[PDB]
Amino acid sequence: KKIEHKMVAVNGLNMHLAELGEGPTILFIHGFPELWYSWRHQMVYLAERGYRAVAPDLRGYGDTTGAPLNDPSKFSILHLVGDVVALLEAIAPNEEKVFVVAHDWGALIAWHLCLFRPDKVKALVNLSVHFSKRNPKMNVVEGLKAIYGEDHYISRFQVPGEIEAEFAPIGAKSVLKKILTYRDPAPFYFPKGKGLEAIPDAPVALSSWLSEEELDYYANKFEQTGFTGAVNYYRALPINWELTAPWTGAQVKVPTKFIVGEFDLVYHIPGAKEYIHNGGFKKDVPLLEEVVVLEGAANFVSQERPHEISKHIYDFIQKF
């Protein structure tokens, strides 16, 4: 069959869902600046092996409608987990628990799904973004700004209109090409008025995993929606920090596999490698299996290393 597409009303949205295969459900949750389409290789690999792959476009992305682009407070982590819970009730009514695979903002959503409703998740494969303990002193924007300065992308993303105006004359295709092919372990910088000039290019041979047709699929979608919905998730980080105070000291109790590219920028946040490999992460996530670091890979592993990601997911979920 080819991938099927449908609209599902969920938590005040009209959510686009891509679906392939039959059997137990696996929910795939994309991040920034991705779409359902980012999971296509895994959807095929798992559907061929007797699972039902489902991948929505999240709030503010793609073909999903209904969230107010002019109000970033509606892109909080509570709203996003709300969407996913409602989605699961609508599309997996005969399954108390499903498998979850997620990346980047997806993985942030998934960690919170697991803290808030562990009863809904059988096992979790998270890519790129490790569990982040809440810092009682400061929110993630302030914390990253204190390390990397005001040109750090998360900081430059904060005020509505600003990064949108920076990207407007560049066009979506070049912005996405620059982000998707990015390989340097430092964070993205967007100095005001400097477009993409602060972001280095890697050798062209290292990006051949991204076809021109794939890039165009993203570009055409983000030209239609603009970047605001996606960027709004980062604009809700300050409120997310306030809203998540009840989960200080709480642990994730779902069986979990974490996979990260060697050159992933999140993996190079100071203190991340220590947290991940020397015990902190295991304390927060006590059913965490050994962490997988993909040699030679960067920020978009499901697309850059499709076979390894596909088989890692299959082998992990087969344990259950």
How long is the chain?
Answer: 320
* Positive or negative torsion for Cα 120, 125, 128, 129: positive
Per the structure, how many domains does the chain have?
1
Tokens of 79: 């709203």
Query: Please, what is the angle between helix 306-318 and helix 40-48, to 10°?
Result: 40
Contact 304, 34 (CB under 8 A): no
**SS3 category, 85:** helix
Instruction: Label the pairing between strands 13-20 and 121-127.
Output: unpaired
Tell me the CATH number at 15: 3.40.50.1820
Tell me if the bond preceding 93 is cis, omega within 30° of 0. Answer: no
Measured in whole angstroms, the distance separating CA 297 from the mean position of its chain's CA atoms is: 17
- Residue in the structure block whose two tokens are 């490999």: 277
Distance CA 188, CA 184 (A): 9
Spatial strand order in the sheet of 25-29: 4-10, 13-20, 52-56, 25-29, 98-103, 121-127, 256-261, 292-294
Long-range contacts of 96-100 (CB under 8 A, 24+ apart): 96/120, 97/121, 97/122, 98/24, 98/25, 98/26, 98/27, 98/122, 99/24, 99/25, 99/26, 99/27, 99/51, 99/123, 99/124, 99/125, 99/317, 99/320, 100/26, 100/27, 100/29, 100/124, 100/125
Method: X-ray
**Structure token pair of residue 183:** 């390989």
d(CA 168, CA 166): 6
- E strands within the chain? 4-10, 13-20, 25-29, 52-56, 98-103, 121-127, 256-261, 292-294
Range of the domain at 151: 1-320
